[PDB]
Design a binder for this molecule. Structure first.
Ligand SMILES: C[C@]12CC[C@@H]3c4ccc(O)cc4CC[C@H]3[C@@H]1CC[C@@H]2O[C@@H]1O[C@H](C(=O)O)[C@@H](O)[C@H](O)[C@H]1O
Ligand SMILES: C[C@]12CC[C@@H]3c4ccc(O)cc4CC[C@H]3[C@@H]1CC[C@@H]2O[C@@H]1O[C@H](C(=O)O)[C@@H](O)[C@H](O)[C@H]1O
Length: 1375
């Protein structure tokens, strides 16, 4: 304060200039100054002046070493200049979105900046240069740079701004509240409040999100990127390398990535202020003479400079996540414009699944790279400028310090890539298990209709046990991610202290280096343990951008192949010298073809299969490339692919397909195609969802849908490529009569047809034959009838939060003896760490007057033995918790499965089995291995934060009052976030998939999308469907920030109230305890924002356990073993069946199926049940095996009831032929005997009796032959022969046949009936009536009427009585 004390003229000015002036920017609202690059320069030069105002500040702090404490006004005024011009930069950025033609105050700002500088300048311009050479070199260079930059600021402020052209108040949806938001309210992210309130008192549905801001509508961002890629042309203005996606991607985000480097720089280069004020405070309290206001100022400025660096960081993640989302959109939308205009040979070259995999992967790989990408230059600058401080403050003993972190990184990458093969590439066991789960789910019926369930229980338990034995070795080595985060700080401190002590004996320890080091390492190791993730994402994203660049350099034949301007009059379809080839390396399918077609007539193309008929239509659409020839298409086009294309939406727009709904015309098209017959089946009618979403409409129906689309779209030329392949003749003829032919609606259309039919030919106006891709004849049908030349060839040829109870339940799964040995053991480890630190504190203070310094050889020792325990009593937690997790997964899966098979048939009847299949796939993988590490890290961060909040308390025992707000505010903000972020996570996960589902539907229908020139009006459906994703992924990004302003505010009030309370009790403390209490208070604002990044992430994964508890306790009601009351065995041979008024229904509350049925059956009595087909005799078959339980009456077999026996002993003594013979996927060994209890000779003998011995003998392995999924690789007759072989093996004395003639071939049905007559002559046989011809043979027959018996009699006598049996026998034409 000698001559430059006046430098405070500008600063305080702002603190009165800002508020009063700011109101002028609020009374007038919009303004919207346009951004000229002069504004960008005005911004960035402020940042440069800021960095020099940092350089002089750390030159002032350099005085800390070499002897003196800094002079009073040296470490205050540069740091107020460097916050005032930060405010200047922020105000520039804010008026960038305002409307001031000129400031009127910032002008005075710069004027006074020059005024307060020239007078000091005039006093040293000649008083320091001619006197010598030194002239306070750094302090003078600072003035020189400041002078140059302020002169630039003045000359840039001499300008004037353009007229506001402010705005027009267009619409009032929910606007994205960054526009129309005060500067002070867009700094603390406070404008999000008005939604976080509504995210906790209400549910959120899509209509209540932000209406996305006008900059990004997914088509003003893909426009820029696509144009930049266009700038990568051949560049008319070396090695062929012209394609360069990276250059064009970089050249369109400079204004959003170099604005996001003037924040990370300011932040990290600013965060090194706290580890210097800490040394200042420690040095202060060590001196009991300095006035207390010095300490108060240092504390109150520590808080400010540790908050304003926490507000130019949590205001940087916003700008570096919005850019990630902009990547994820700009690529998802430029991958699309190419996917619409590919050449179908390229589509042949790959699979549509991987064309999708260019999204959800390789394009979602970005936005997972943007947060880390900026770290490339931060990692050195946050190291080489943080190694300097330690090497300046602990001597060259920090070599080992950072060396341990550097060594850790490869040893944290190796045992993270070992999992990339030992934990994901060994999960083919999971795929086999889920395929087996789908195998035993689809077909559970037949498996339950008789025995063999426990065999499959064991056969899935084997793979479960194997894969869990694997995981025992796959989570044990997942305890190297807790080792880092809760042993690297302590261990590196131990190593560096040990080396520093034992390098020389005359460099004694003291607080102002040990504690500043232990607090500066904390700053060092956040942007150093997130380095392995960077080095992995760079690899797995450079592998991705390579593939994206590859897929974007392909072939497009759109520009011109079939011109549409000049057409010969009187002709509509004309080709001259038409040569068409599918691929340049393929033979030419069509050779110099010359086809001319008139206007409005009918033309068809005939010939052998694939001789050019399935290629001409492709060539006409311009899809197929041409070597020579001229084609002239006139007007609109319609095209019906052989493989119908159906959009995953409602049928009405699947037929409307983007045109105005004409009602009468729409129903005319619907009725002409005769879709009404199918339409009546649809529940929602024309508004029913269609496609992958729901019912798999038959190709014979989807072809009708596509034809209706074509005819409604009333184009002028129709192309038909075998549109009646699965459409039956009786309906196809009417389709042609009402639509295609001149008698149809399309009389005045230039229709073209590709056919394999015959009766369609005679009424055709014009026929062209084709063969070998070369035309051979042409003309009207009679011209080809009499010739019988080329035509003869084909003439002959053809939501609330989870309740706490669930958590306890999970603990019960882990085992209380373990889950009570973890929380206790973490308490132990926290005690060990807090003891180690409070021991280091008592080590530091000893050096003040220690007259026996040899004691320093002891403390260090016990330090190791006080933290190695903590470095070993957390491994005993992580290993034990991994073991508990795998054990809990084992027990939970065992219970879920072991209970689900036993569930009654009704459950699988009502449940859409695929939902059961999502479990064993997703809702148990989550429980298995993405919930135990989450437990580890949650329960680990919690005990890392309790250690801090207890150590600060124990060090400075007086700030107990302040912890009450520091808890109530924290829990309040955590509750609000846990509501809103969870809601948004759900609402974004819901809408993520429909993007990918809308893709994989346009690549396949690439050709169908064209030929209606609807491609252009089809991106506007793609981009709106990613806009509906973005508007639920922006607020998530600005809801994970508004938390970290209500957290990194508490985590800094705890720094203010640690330092200030240390100062207020200076006389009662020592430097060691204060260094401890401040060094860990500075560290808590990270270990307390890391305890919400997971305590609100586990809340979205514990739900899995919830589901695995809802899919249980489902009334097994199937006691298989009642051994105390076994029936006497060996009662097939008696073979007596006796119903006694047995009354049964499907479910309690459902209709009554059977009504007091009674019967009298003896051994060998072949009996069939007759009645009305569809009455539910299958229900009676199910009752025989107790699939449905009676409410009255019972079934007595040989004097033995069915309700007093275990289910398996019951079902084992019977024999069934299921109506659908299923074939378990795999060998024939288990498909005949999963238990393998029947010898090879018996099985071969029975297969000989099965009359499939020839086919299996022809097979190489015979019984070891592999069966495809659902037994698809064997013929139908083979399936029935397999099921009857299954029946033959067991060979009981009771048979009950079940409708083996649903849609089963008769040629093998004769064999089945003959066999079951032959070998089953000594067994009681039931039979369900699907045919009256073959039931005229059994000795006796049951007559049944939906639950009431009529008689037991022979068919010869039943027709004589002239009853229902006779009526139905006569209705079949047999009497
Ligand atoms: C990258 C993350 C943010 C920044 C942290 C970070 C920054 C810099 C740095 O050098 C190191 C680290 C360490 C770990 C990083 C966090 C992991 C998940 C999160 O990533 C995103 O967070 C978003 C949000 O809530 O804003 C979520 O919305 C997104 O879904 C999520 O992907
Ligand atoms: C980033 C982590 C989760 C969140 C914590 C966090 C969040 C927000 C925040 O502001 C600060 C911090 C501090 C440290 C962060 C953790 C370190 C490793 C972990 O990240 C790991 O990555 C693993 C992988 O994908 O291979 C996954 O298993 C898990 O996500 C996890 O184990």
């Amino acid at each position: 304060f000698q001559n430059s004390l006046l430098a405070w003229v500008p600063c305080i000015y702002l603190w009165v200039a800002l508020p009063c002036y700011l109101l002028y920017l609020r009374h007038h609202c919009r303004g919207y100054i346009i951004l000229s690059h002069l504004s960008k320069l005005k911004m960035v030069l402020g940042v440069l002046l800021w960095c020099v105002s940092w350089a002089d500040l750390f030159y002032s702090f350099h005085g800390l070493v070499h002897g003196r404490a800094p002079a009073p006004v040296f470490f205050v005024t540069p740091l107020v200049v460097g916050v005032t011009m930060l405010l200047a930069t922020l105000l520039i950025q804010y008026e960038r979105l305002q409307g001031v033609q000129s400031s009127g105050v910032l002008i005075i700002f710069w004027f006074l900046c020059v005024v307060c500088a020239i007078v000091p300048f005039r006093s040293k311009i000649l008083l320091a240069k001619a006197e010598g050479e030194i002239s306070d070199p750094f302090r003078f260079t600072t003035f020189y740079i400041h002078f140059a930059l302020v002169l630039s600021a003045l000359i840039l402020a001499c300008f004037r701004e353009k007229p506001p052209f402010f705005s027009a108040k267009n619409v009032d949806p929910n606007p994205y509240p960054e526009t129309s938001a005060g500067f002070l309210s867009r700094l603390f992210f406070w404008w999000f409040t008005k939604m976080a309130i509504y995210g906790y008192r209400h549910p959120l549905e899509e209509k209540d999100l932000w209406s996305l801001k006008e900059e990004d509508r997914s088509q003003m961002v893909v426009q820029q990127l696509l144009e930049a890629w266009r700038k990568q042309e051949k560049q008319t203005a070396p090695r062929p390398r012209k394609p360069s996606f990276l250059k064009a991607l970089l050249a369109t985000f400079g204004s959003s990535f170099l604005i996001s480097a003037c924040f990370k720089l300011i932040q990290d280069l600013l965060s090194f202020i706290n580890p210097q004020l800490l040394s200042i405070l420690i040095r202060f309290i060590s001196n009991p003479m300095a006035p207390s206001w010095w300490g108060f100022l240092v504390a109150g400025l520590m808080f400010l400079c540790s908050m304003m660096q926490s507000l130019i960081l949590q205001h940087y993640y916003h700008y570096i996540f919005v850019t990630g989302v902009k990547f994820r959109t700009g690529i998802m939308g430029v991958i699309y414009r190419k996917a619409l205009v590919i050449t179908n040979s390229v589509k042949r070259a790959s699979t549509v699944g991987e064309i999708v995999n260019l999204m959800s992967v390789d394009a979602q790989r970005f936005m997972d790279l943007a947060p880390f990408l900026n770290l490339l230059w931060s990692a050195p600058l946050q190291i080489i400028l943080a190694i300097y401080f330690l090497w300046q403050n602990l001597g060259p003993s920090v070599l080992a310090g950072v060396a341990f972190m550097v060594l850790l990184i490869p040893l944290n990458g190796a045992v993270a890539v070992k999992m990339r093969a030992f934990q994901v590439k060994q999960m083919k066991l999971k795929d086999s298990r889920i395929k087996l789960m789908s195998e035993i789910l689809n077909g559970i019926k037949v498996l339950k209709l008789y025995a063999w369930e426990p065999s499959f229980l064991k056969q899935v338990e084997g793979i479960r046990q194997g894969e869990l034995q694997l995981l025992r070795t796959a989570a044990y080595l997942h305890t190297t991610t807790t080792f880092t985060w809760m042993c690297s700080p302590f261990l590196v401190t131990l190593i560096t202290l040990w080396v520093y002590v034992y390098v020389d004996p005359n460099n004694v320890l003291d607080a102002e280096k040990a504690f500043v080091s232990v607090s500066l390492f904390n700053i060092l190791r956040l942007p150093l343990n997130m380095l392995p993730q960077l080095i992995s994402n760079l690899t797995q994203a450079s592998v991705s951008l390579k593939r994206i660049q590859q897929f974007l350099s392909q072939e497009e034949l759109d520009p011109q192949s079939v011109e549409r301007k000049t057409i010969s009059p009187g002709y509509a379809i004309t080709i001259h010298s038409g040569t068409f080839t599918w691929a340049q390396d393929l033979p030419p399918t069509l050779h110099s073809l010359d086809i001319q077609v008139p206007k409005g007539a009918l033309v068809a193309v005939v010939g052998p299969v694939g001789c050019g008929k399935s290629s001409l239509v492709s060539a006409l659409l311009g899809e197929m490339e041409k070597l020579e020839g001229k084609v002239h298409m006139k007007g609109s086009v319609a095209y019906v692919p052989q493989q119908a294309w159906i959009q995953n939406c409602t049928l009405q727009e699947n037929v409307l397909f983007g045109k105005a709904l004409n009602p009468k015309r729409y129903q005319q098209t619907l009725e002409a195609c005769a879709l009404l017959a199918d339409l009546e089946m649809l529940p929602g009618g024309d508004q029913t969802e269609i496609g992958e979403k729901g019912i798999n409409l038959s190709g014979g129906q989807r072809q009708r849908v596509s034809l209706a689309r074509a005819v409604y779209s009333d184009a002028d030329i129709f192309l038909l490529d075998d549109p009646l392949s699965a459409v039956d003749s009786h309906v196809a003829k009417h389709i042609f009569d009402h639509v295609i032919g001149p008698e149809g609606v399309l009389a005045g259309k230039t229709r073209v047809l590709v056919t394999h039919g015959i009766s369609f030919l005679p009424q055709t106006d014009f026929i062209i034959v084709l063969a070998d891709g070369q035309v051979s004849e042409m003309g009207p049908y009679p011209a080809l009838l009499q010739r019988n030349g080329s035509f003869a060839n084909f003439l002959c040829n053809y939501i609330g939060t989870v309740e706490l109870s669930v958590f306890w339940d999970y603990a019960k799964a882990v085992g209380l003896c373990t889950t009570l040995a973890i929380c206790l053991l973490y308490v132990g480890q926290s005690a060990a760490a807090i003891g180690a630190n409070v021991w280091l504190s008592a080590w530091t203070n000893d050096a003040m007057a220690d007259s026996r310094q040899n004691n320093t050889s002891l403390r260090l020792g016990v330090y190791a033995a006080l933290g190695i325990l903590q470095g070993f009593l957390v491994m005993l937690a992580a290993m034990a918790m991994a073991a508990g997790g795998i054990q809990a997964a084992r027990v939970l899966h065992q219970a879920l499965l072991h209970n689900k098979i036993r569930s009654p048939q009704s459950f699988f009847d009502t449940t859409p089995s695929g939902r059961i299949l999502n479990c064993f796939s997703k809702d148990i993988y989550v429980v298995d291995e993405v919930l135990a590490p989450v437990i580890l890290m949650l329960l680990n961060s919690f005990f890392n934060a309790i250690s801090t909040l207890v150590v600060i308390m124990a060090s400075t025992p007086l700030f107990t009052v302040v912890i009450l707000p520091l808890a109530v505010l924290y829990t309040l903000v955590q509750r609000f976030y846990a509501a809103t972020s969870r809601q948004l996570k759900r609402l974004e996960s819901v809408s993520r998939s429909p993007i990918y589902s809308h893709f994989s539907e346009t690549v396949t229908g690439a050709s169908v999308i064209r030929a209606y020139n609807r491609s252009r009006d089809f991106e506007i459906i793609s981009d709106t469907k990613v806009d509906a994703n973005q508007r639920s992924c922006y607020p998530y990004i600005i809801s994970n920030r508004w938390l970290s302003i209500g957290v990194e505010f508490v985590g800094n009030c705890v720094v203010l109230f640690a330092a200030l309370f240390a100062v207020i009790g200076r006389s009662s403390l020592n430097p060691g305890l204060v260094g401890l209490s401040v060094s860990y208070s500075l560290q808590v604002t990270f270990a307390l924002n890391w305890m919400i990044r997971m305590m609100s992430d586990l809340e979205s994964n514990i739900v899995a356990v919830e589901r695995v508890k809802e899919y249980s306790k489902t009334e097994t009601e199937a006691p298989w073993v009642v051994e105390g009351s076994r029936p006497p065995e060996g009662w097939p041979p008696r073979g007596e069946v006796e119903f006694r008024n047995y009354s049964v229904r499907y479910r309690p509350g459902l209709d009554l199926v059977l009504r007091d049925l009674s019967l009298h059956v003896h051994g060998g009595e072949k009996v069939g049940i007759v009645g009305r087909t569809g009455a539910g005799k299958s229900s009676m078959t199910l009752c025989l095996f107790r699939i449905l339980e009676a409410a009255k009456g019972e079934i007595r077999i040989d004097g033995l009831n069915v309700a007093d026996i275990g289910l398996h002993d019951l079902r084992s003594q019977l024999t069934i032929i299921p109506q659908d013979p299923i074939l378990f996927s795999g060998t024939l060994r288990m498909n005949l005997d999963p238990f393998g209890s029947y010898s090879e000779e018996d099985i071969w003998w029975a297969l000989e009796l099965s009359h499939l011995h020839t086919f299996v003998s022809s097979q190489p392995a015979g019984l070891d032959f592999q069966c495809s999924e659902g037994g698809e690789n064997l013929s139908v007759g083979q399936r029935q022969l397999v099921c009857l072989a299954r029946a033959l093996l067991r060979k009981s004395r009771i048979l009950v046949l079940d409708e083996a003639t649903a849609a089963i071939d008769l040629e093998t049905d004769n064999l089945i009936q003959a066999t079951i007559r032959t070998q089953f002559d000594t067994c009681t046989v039931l039979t369900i009536a699907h045919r009256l011809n073959t039931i005229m043979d059994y000795t006796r027959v049951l007559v049944l009427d939906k639950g009431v018996v009529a008689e037991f009699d022979s068919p010869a006598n039943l027709i004589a009585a002239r009853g229902i049996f006779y009526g139905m026998a006569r209705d079949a034409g047999l009497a």
